[PDB]
Amino acid sequence: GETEEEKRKREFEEGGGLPEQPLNPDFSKLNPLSAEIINRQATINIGTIGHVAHGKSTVVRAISGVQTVRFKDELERNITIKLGYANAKIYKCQEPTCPEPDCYRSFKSDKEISPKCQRPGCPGRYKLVRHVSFVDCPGHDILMSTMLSGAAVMDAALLLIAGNESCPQPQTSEHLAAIEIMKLKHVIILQNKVDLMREESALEHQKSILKFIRGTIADGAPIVPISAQLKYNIDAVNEFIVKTIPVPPRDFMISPRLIVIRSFDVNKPGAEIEDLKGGVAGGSILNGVFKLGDEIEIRPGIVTKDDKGKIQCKPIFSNIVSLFAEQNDLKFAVPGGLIGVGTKVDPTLCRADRLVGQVVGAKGHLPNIYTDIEINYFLLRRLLGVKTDGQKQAKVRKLEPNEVLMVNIGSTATGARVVAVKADMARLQLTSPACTEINEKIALSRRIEKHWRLIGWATIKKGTTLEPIA
Amino acid sequence: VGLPYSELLSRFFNILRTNNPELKFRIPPPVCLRDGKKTIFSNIQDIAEKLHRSPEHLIQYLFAELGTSGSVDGKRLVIKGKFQSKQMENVLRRYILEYVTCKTCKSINTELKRENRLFFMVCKSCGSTRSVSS
Amino acid sequence: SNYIHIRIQQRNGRKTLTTVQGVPEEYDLKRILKVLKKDFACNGNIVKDPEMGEIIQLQGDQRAKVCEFMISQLGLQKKNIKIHGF
RNA sequence: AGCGCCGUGGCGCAGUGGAAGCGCGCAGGGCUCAUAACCCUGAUGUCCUCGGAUCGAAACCGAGCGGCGCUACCA
RNA sequence: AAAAUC
Numbered sequence A: 001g002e003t004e005e006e007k008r009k010r011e012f013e014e015g016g017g018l019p020e021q022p023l024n025p026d027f028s029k030l031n032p033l034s035a036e037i038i039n040r041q042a043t044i045n046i047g048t049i050g051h052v053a054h055g056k057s058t059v060v061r062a063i064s065g066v067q068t069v070r071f072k073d074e075l076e077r078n079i080t081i082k083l084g085y086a087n088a089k090i091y092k093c094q095e096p097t098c099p100e101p102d103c104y105r106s107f108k109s110d111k112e113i114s115p116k117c118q119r120p121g122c123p124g125r126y127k128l129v130r131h132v133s134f135v136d137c138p139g140h141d142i143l144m145s146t147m148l149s150g151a152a153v154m155d156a157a158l159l160l161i162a163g164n165e166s167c168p169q170p171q172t173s174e175h176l177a178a179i180e181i182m183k184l185k186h187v188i189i190l191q192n193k194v195d196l197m198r199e200e201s202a203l204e205h206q207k208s209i210l211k212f213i214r215g216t217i218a219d220g221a222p223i224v225p226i227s228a229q230l231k232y233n234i235d236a237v238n239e240f241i242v243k244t245i246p247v248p249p250r251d252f253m254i255s256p257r258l259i260v261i262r263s264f265d266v267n268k269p270g271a272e273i274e275d276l277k278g279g280v281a282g283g284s285i286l287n288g289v290f291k292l293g294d295e296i297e298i299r300p301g302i303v304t305k306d307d308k309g310k311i312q313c314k315p316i317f318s319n320i321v322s323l324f325a326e327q328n329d330l331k332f333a334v335p336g337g338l339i340g341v342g343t344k345v346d347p348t349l350c351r352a353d354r355l356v357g358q359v360v361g362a363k364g365h366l367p368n369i370y371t372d373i374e375i376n377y378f379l380l381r382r383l384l385g386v387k388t389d390g391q392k393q394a395k396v397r398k399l400e401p402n403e404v405l406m407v408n409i410g411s412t413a414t415g416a417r418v419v420a421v422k423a424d425m426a427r428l429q430l431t432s433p434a435c436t437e438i439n440e441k442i443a444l445s446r447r448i449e450k451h452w453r454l455i456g457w458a459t460i461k462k463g464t465t466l467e468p469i470a
Numbered sequence B: 001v002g003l004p005y006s007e008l009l010s011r012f013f014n015i016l017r018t019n020n021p022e023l024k025f026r027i028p029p030p031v032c033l034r035d036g037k038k039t040i041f042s043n044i045q046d047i048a049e050k051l052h053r054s055p056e057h058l059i060q061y062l063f064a065e066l067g068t069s070g071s072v073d074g075k076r077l078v079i080k081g082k083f084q085s086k087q088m089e090n091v092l093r094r095y096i097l098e099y100v101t102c103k104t105c106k107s108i109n110t111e112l113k114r115e116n117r118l119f120f121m122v123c124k125s126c127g128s129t130r131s132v133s134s
Numbered sequence C: 001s002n003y004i005h006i007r008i009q010q011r012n013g014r015k016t017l018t019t020v021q022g023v024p025e026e027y028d029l030k031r032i033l034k035v036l037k038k039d040f041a042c043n044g045n046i047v048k049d050p051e052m053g054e055i056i057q058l059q060g061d062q063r064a065k066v067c068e069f070m071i072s073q074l075g076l077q078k079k080n081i082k083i084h085g086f
Numbered sequence D: 001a002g003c004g005c006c007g008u009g010g011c012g013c014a015g016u017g018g019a020a021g022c023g024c025g026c027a028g029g030g031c032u033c034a035u036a037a038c039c040c041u042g043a044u045g046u047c048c049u050c051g052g053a054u055c056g057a058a059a060c061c062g063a064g065c066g067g068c069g070c071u072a073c074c075a
Numbered sequence E: 001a002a003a004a005u006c
Ligand SMILES: Nc1nc2c(ncn2[C@@H]2O[C@H](COP(=O)(O)OP(=O)(O)CP(=O)(O)O)[C@@H](O)[C@H]2O)c(=O)[nH]1
Pocket: A050, A051, A052, A053, A054, A055, A056, A057, A058, A077, A078, A079, A080, A137, A138, A139, A140, A192, A193, A196, A227, A228, A229, B104, B105, B128, B129, B130, B131
């Protein structure tokens, strides 16, 4: 006769709950699979891609259970602009008796270390093999800056295809190709509509998709039939995630850095402002741990245009007040995840889409901002994301001087002007600043049909730097 | 490799055949009583029941479509106008296509809810989040 | 949003009036009333109705004809525009 | 989530502090040969619910509800 | 004056 809350609390207290991370553990013995890390912070960022109106957030809600906050009363229904973040924990059943496909289970991040197996008749306890962060990239043909920023954030991929619709969806191919542009190859194929398909039709669809992914760089892409609605074949997805995708190399031997992709202002209205919190920049940490209380600087920061039209860039210095990596504030941070670094930054810097795709460095390092950038660029044969009713899918042309091109340098979305074009290299003038740390893998999109269409990939080889003014 | 994909396809087809042996043609013929100047629908209760829709939402939809303000008697929708049966049939079909049945699946199992304050349709067999409010 | 529909109002001696409610502002209204008048030989009014909007009232009882003008002038949909029997 | 607007007798506005208003409707009648126009007649309410100063309140306030509007998705 | 139908 126990209530649901009482049963949940009993399972939580049986399983150990969520132990607090040690304040200053020995970081030379701390792998991404340690209990202090695995139980309370993500180490792998896996992201979902698919064409418009497919249920990209619904599949992640099925896997994890946490909503992406599809906001704005107009993005409620059609498309989101900002990404959809989600946390799920991969738990395997320790008893060999239960079937291997059903051994795995993705739960919410509120779960404990050892939850009991919900399978009827199984007394085993679940072991957390990994907790993974989820990134959802909107797939609309005007909003591609967010998808490329996410791809720069990405570490693992999940591609989605609809059944009853046409096999060659341009947007799914665009997402795939953009993923292989960003040095990403762990891609898993997901067919969502199997419930509304027949025995034979899904076979021709899978044949067409197999023929589709034959010449692209990624070859070993497993295919998973899922249901965002019937909520089945989820444990198989988790098993494939754990097996096929290992951890990209990441340790604590590299200097810290941050790539802020979202802006979040903690301004709970109605209450007195005598009790407020810090302004939070949501960013991916691709390298370098952070600990509770640090001095950091957003390198692009203040961008002003003086009385001559010249650009002045002041890094935004800030002391880190909190690190909302997970539901409870953590003492440290782990590379390869999304963390909300809450500093003393004024919340209006985080109110709107302002801290979108910017680069941030800890004190003791000086990431260099650049105004003119030398770029080595390679291009694809034909445009992608365009539907052609049977006539020679449009071929990507060559660049021309003095034109605006959306140059997504990792997360930074800039409209660059091409000063010169060579056989493989070009010079870009940026009206919006970008800072070059190591390589910052670039993607390029050209305005050919009104909206942007991706063209190819690029790498920074040189640049013309600007000195920050403290 | 697509070999371990057909096994999960077959398992999913098995679970569908176990769970949904049915997989609407459950639209009652609309009965429109013409009484001089008055147009009566003594069957709108059955329309609401068979379409799994609350009556007042259906009335709101009808009077957002048509330019009238009519009353309800206890179970029956009575209005004062000269309205044909074809119009009632077509508004029922439009309500079915845009509200009642899923626009991505063949299902009526959705019902009416309010997610910040707007009507946000949610299903029961599939549970997909799609919403139409006009 | 912005649905389009036409209504008929009768009068004494079988004479009738037609109203299209909701008109896109991409093309202006006087330039459209000019060519309504010739193709229809009926009087027309750009009347203001509160909480309703600008209405191009026309004489006669014509629905396929205003629709046939709509298909050519600005309308490219022929799905949102609704025809009322009455 | 926060602050602005509203609460019919079918619909709107008005009074808000002597306790049920008007027009629009609806119904009937009269005008007439006959339709509009016009002229008469009605029958519908804790004017959203719960408390309070008040001889008194639907009205003045408030402790909550429903629907609209802006801030804006507010880690 | 406004006048309508037929
Ligand atoms: N048949 C079916 N419909 C689904 C499924 N998931 C979502 N839908 C429906 O299809 C639409 C897509 O869902 P939604 O989550 O809004 O799409 P999205 O993938 O977020 C859109 P984008 O790709 O542009 O980011 C919705 O209207 C929803 O009702 C699914 O698994 N099956």
